[PDB]
Design a binder for these strands. Structure first.
Length: 49
DNA sequence: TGCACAGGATGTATATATCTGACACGTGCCTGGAGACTAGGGAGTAATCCCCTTGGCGGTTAAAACGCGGGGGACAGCGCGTACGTGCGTTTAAGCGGTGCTAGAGCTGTCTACGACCAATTGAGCGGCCTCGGCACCGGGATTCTCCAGGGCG
């Protein structure tokens, strides 16, 4: 993940990113820094709580 | 003449009177033993609330666990030599017996500052709160920093 995040910030290396549900719990501090346009949730019956 | 002896002239442990030191016994003045009054500090209870558990499925991650290569560092063997161990004679100085002192250690009245004990005020310090600027974590990039392969050199 560090190797994925070293081409991350300054330029645009991707038009979309694929991140698992549970990884945003640990990496929430890193993912909250970058601005985003669309964040979509699959099978929302998880987050329902 | 060469020799044994009878008694004095010195030693020497032996037995007796004598000199410290420590245990043992008989007192009387600062201690304990005990009796009564006060009272606030300790034993006991009625909510309480508040964080701390109960029991176990799964999914996933970061940390724990195992496995091999080998590199270098622990470690055994062994020779050296000088640095203390051991043994003499020679000296300086403490141990100890005894002395003349004193100046500071040590027990006792005076009173007098001066701190113990107790009402009245409050304000400075403690419970409650709610923010934002310093802090937490990480990318970007430059910088250093060590690892490995010649090769010019033995």
């Amino acid at each position: 993940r560090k190797e994925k995040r070293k081409g991350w910030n300054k330029p645009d290396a991707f038009h979309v990113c694929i991140v698992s549900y549970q990884l945003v719990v640990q990496d929430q501090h890193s993912f909250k820094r970058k601005r985003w346009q669309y964040m979509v949730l699959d099978e929302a019956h998880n987050i329902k709580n």
